[PDB]
Design a binder for this molecule. Structure first.
Ligand SMILES: [Mg+2]
Ligand SMILES: [Mg+2]
Lengths: 169, 163, 164, 163, 164, 169, 169, 169, 163, 164, 164, 163
């Protein structure tokens, strides 16, 4: 009989901040402000503790820390947010990014009462794209040369989904 | 056996946190640092008052006095028991204690509470304690995907003090 | 005659102060102007309340308060106050319609509610007409001028507004 | 003819000052800068409340609510009329007004006052308003070279509201 | 057995917190320790109150509060509290004598006074003995545990102390 | 002989703040923070004076104040920004929004050295859309129900252009 | 019939500070801290507004500003203070220093409830000394070379009086 | 052969503050501000660290802490200060107060370059008085009821000495 | 006729502003409030020093000493004349003045300047003042759509003082 | 052996302090650690400089400084320093390549430049090899250990990097 | 004509600013008024320097600076500056006498000293006359307008003043 | 054997203190808390610079550069050796080191020192290092009961660099 893992969103605590930092060279941001060194992240963190426009969860698999969900650009008048998920290397390969997306959908849609959620992914990532489609995300744009990455401008696909689709299922 | 009702101390916050969206002085929290910070910001704020419910010296739940007003002499209260302490009607004794505090110590005139309409047990309990119903608040909360109704119930100091 | 809402500027704060005995700003009490100026400065970016001067032909005629605004549960309480001299011209009615408009068509709330004196059978009727539901009768909710009074809480929903 | 009772505004301070040792929030003042400063320090302090007494729109005196407590539901009041307005029993109407405010607006249970024993007029006035005597405080004040006695008198909300 | 007053140190503040339901510091209310620590830090140089641990053979046994201290009128109110386990050994009596000593022979006050429950006929008697005068009976001065209680205010003067 | 107007971008001064405020009910934002009352705007303004992620110009026509250009979400690693233009009512009807766009293109492209600029407009605004095309903006997405406006979710068209296109002309 | 002047102590207001400053070269002090320039005095003044250990009155003669009384080193446990009076040049010669002393005695003794007041004066000032005696001040010390003044150490006479003497009269 | 103790003034460090506090009921002061609880003393201490108008030494006897010298009311224009010495109970009886006075004389006179030092003592203390005389202190005043002490006003004797007397010896 | 070189005062800022992207203490500005603020932030900063160029008492341009270093004893200078004052070789006299200040007052050893390669006039002027060329900085600035080259030129205190 | 850049953490600040006599942080001088700790705290979010520890097999081996970073003109100066004991293993070469990589493939700069002692003919040659151009010779730019020295400024461009 | 010292008020600070190229306040350099206003505000209670306007018939004529004031060693340096238009009327002489008076008869210093250009043989002579001693010749102490200059340090003592 | 000259670090303060009236940035200290505080107040102050003198890695003395000025390019220096390290002419090597730093690193033109007239050894040492005498400062210090004379001596960068 196959054993069932338990995957949970958990509100991101300060003690989680080291875990965040060491998920990894590229630009990372906190509240649209960029960081590199731990001291930069930690100070941003305290400056933004009460800020309602981003919310972050750790993904626990069986209580162990496996990755991070960031809801970002939260807007409560237009009832949307963007999300971003990131799975620690030793937790990849086993459907986590998927479950993890379902859980963030659940959070924005059933807890936070947003109307629309979207995400950006590399145009190159035919894998992820197709998964999101599977879950019934529409494609709403192909941003051209939106990111300059490892020496080169890359294209992003923005894909959205809606509260009613979600609750209908 | 023994249930006291101790003021909420800063060491109690990690306990509090370890019990859907939560409010401290009407400002929302999720992280423990969010609530901790919020806590010190509202240290001398008289508009809310909190107590750990102690069973035989162990921390077993929480009473909140919220929206305390001394001109109109009223306040709201929420009571929360930890799972492992539920279903011995601490929820009940805690309610009496809250009532004792607000009516005999704080000298309030009126105490009210909100509860999900569906919670027929609580509604019954409080009616037993002689609370009367004053409202059915339609779709007052978005809870886990859905709007829910609450029932608000009150009781008055003269009713209590009949004791 | 024409009637508009307008965000409340510090310059309006003197006007607000003297509509006449007990009142609040961002839930803290106030009486003197200095008390009020101070709260106002403190709550400049507080999202949980939003105010408006009610303008009647470019003239300050009253005030709309949007209070206890919650965006997760998409609701908010409102209250209107009309300077003595603009009363009895159905102005608080037009102001109500306008506050609904704002919370429903701009703030994107789901539910708006208010509390009035049970005794005010008149206002009560005006709301019922507008399609508001009674959602409760609070007993002795307010000590006012020497006695406890009852109030009625009445609510209306976005979809009812966007329909009719 | 007309007597209102307006909240004390900052413009009123120069008036206040222009009326032996004075107290603001139990801290003493003499200079106007001493009182002014003190004033802002106690802006959101609910423990005292002040009003100018207005006769036909002119500033004519002062009511102070001091030591306001909402659990025991009581407060003290001092009333001060400016000379040119004395002896028309504004002192009286002012007292009623204070009483009106504390009992019908602020929802206090009990109001008391201190007055020099020797002030037989005030003592009589208040007894007329139905205040009862609760103490003769021996040498409670050093005033102009000498200890003086005060009389403390109270009245209760139920007594007033009989109206 | 020997009994002393001792100025109250921050280290005593944990002791003070748990003598058991409503209390004050420099006239502001408190309940939680964090609330109390804070007031204490704020009032460090406040001249208007002075506190002391009552030490019984080098052991913390209670507390003396000197409150509403006025130096122009040379008076001050006092209150004593004895930990449950040191009561009924005439300790609050020795503590009273000691507080008088301090206000009279050190602070140079002219008058000291206190307030007790009218119902506490015992304490009342102890003070009368010490030469205290009743200077008033306050009616329903305190809402306590469900009802308004009466209190008695009793005073004594320096010259009476320095004589007897 | 037809008289030539002079249209200029001018760096936005504090004294311009009243003009901004009174360009008008809808949500307006300053540095992604929302305002309504003048005191809210003015305080945001001082809080963000040195912030490199938004830049604002007044459009002077013949030295008189005619409208406002906001470059927003400026990113210097991905070399882009979003722009927004707004023409005062008495200056509409006479090609200003157009010239005004050309000028902001010039600023980002020739002064600020961005690589890409884009804009959002109402899907409904077939007029503006076609103009931007005329100037050789590509369409890069149709965001669905992105804004809730006057009681109703509306659709936006994001359209971009690039430094090389611009300098080529 | 000779006309009676009215001489009053008045609590020192900030607007009085210029008058103080220009009562005049020597060391002057405010709360035991020294001043020379107006800005020094004014800043000391604000730093010490609530300080209970010095109190200052202006002497009004017929409502016009004639001089200054400083009660200094106020101690409420030992119930004493030192006083110092200073009469503006155009108000000297007409008994003011005297009345002015009586008034400060009245203030400390009948208002402030001190038990003892004293003063220092130049040993050289046989005039003032004898006046204070007249008013029944005892001599309680002759401080030797206590002040270095205009190139030279000078001797001071400290003289005291008591509440009971005063009220007895 | 009798063994010689070494008695030294040492600048008072913060760690000395507990020792000070526990030299003992009466009013004690720090920079003319009164203290009782340790937290009061310690906060005064930090508020006054750089203040030139009081200086304090510990008296070490053989390196062990035996008492305290306070130079107080230091005035560098009139070149004087008052001093106060206090010997811990277990170090009394063995000439310390004496040596300790000589050392403070040495400090003010030979290090600090004051011209005059004085002290107050109880009129009742015929012992100390006579010692100071022995060292050639003049008596310069008998302050009457200057201190209210243990229920009663007491009289003080102020006694001074001068740099030239001292260096002459 | 007369050219002084006055220290830059706060009243001069509106003038400064009224003269592509500008820098104050290596931080960029455009609005006047941006530069004003920046100005006070760098009031006691010794690393840059500024002067208005005064012709017969009127404000006519600007000298900036920038990147001032006292161990290596060097600094950079920019000079800016207002249009209506250009082409009388104030640019020249201003340069001499800068040179006078840095070499005879500030005791610098070396002064250098950057100028667009294309500005053949400036390059010539300075070579005339005996500045020598020390670099051709390739595409050192993006200016109005294009990378541009600058030429850096220096001169030394001993060379100047030969005077 | 493997070599990486890594953002510089406060924990690295002690390491940085002791590579041996005159140096800067965000253009302000420093000597003592306390001086340095302070500048570092002040410049935490300063975009104009970016630093990195050079790691050799997970071991701290040196430092890369990106200085005078300008994003409008898309350039920045760089400098590398290798702890005494890691020198002469072509490590500063690998570190240079890595700094180019970062400014060119991550920061998206157009131009990177450096300044070396004219006398250092060795380093100079290493850069020329890498495709760097000499863009100037600064005369007596640095007073160092008793005399003014000359320096060379050499630059390279993104397109040259992204090509070869 | 009559000549007085007068403590320097903020109102004098504009006057001070324009006597014409390098100068200090409480040892920090300044040039612009804003720079100076700031130092002045910072040093309001600094005991180590004391300034005075030199008044000639109630008119501002120059300035006296008392600098490096040390009370333990009882000395202080002084400097005088006279507005162009009041020079050559022996005014700096009367101002010197007055500064001596102040430090000697008011501040109770033991020693006062000054530094002048060796080349200024005139001033030098005026001081010698006043009884000042040369206590040193500092070599190349000042870089001024293009070259290092020598200065002379001359001192006088209280007892010499209080005698003659 | 080995003498380095390390910058003064905060851990070195307790050492410093453990070496009559002392000055930090011309402000006086005695307690260690007085000097410690003063220390942080002057952390970025360029007007003074300090170094521990290290003999074979142990702390053995102190060089102070004081009154550093970069326009006139001069500074003063005091050197202090701890007793147990005296009389091996570390005082000498330390002096050379100071000289090395100010002249070859800091690019000063001139260095001077003050020493009690009576210290004939120091005076001789420095004259040997080729310092010349520029003043005999009469009663410049009150030291242990008496005014004392100091001798000031300087040397110049060109003289040193002759090396
Ligand atoms: Mg954004
Ligand atoms: Mg004193």
């Amino acid at each position: 009989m196959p054993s069932a893992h338990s995957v949970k969103l958990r509100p991101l605590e300060r003690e989680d901040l080291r875990y965040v930092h060491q998920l990894d060279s590229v630009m990372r941001y906190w509240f649209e402000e960029p960081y590199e060194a731990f001291v930069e992240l930690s100070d941003l963190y305290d400056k933004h503790i009460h800020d309602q426009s981003e919310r972050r969860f750790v993904v626990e698999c069986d209580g162990e820390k496996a990755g991070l969900v960031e809801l970002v650009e939260i807007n409560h008048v237009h009832r949307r947010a963007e999300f971003q998920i990131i799975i620690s290397p030793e937790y990849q390969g086993k459907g986590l990014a998927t479950r993890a997306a379902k859980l963030a959908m659940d959070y924005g849609f059933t807890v936070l009462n947003l109307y629309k959620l979207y995400l950006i992914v590399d145009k190159e990532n035919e894998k992820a794209i197709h998964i999101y489609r599977k879950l019934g995300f529409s494609v709403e744009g192909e941003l051209m040369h939106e990111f300059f990455i490892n020496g080169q401008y890359r294209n992003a696909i923005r894909m959205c989904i809606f509260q009613h689709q979600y609750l209908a299922e």
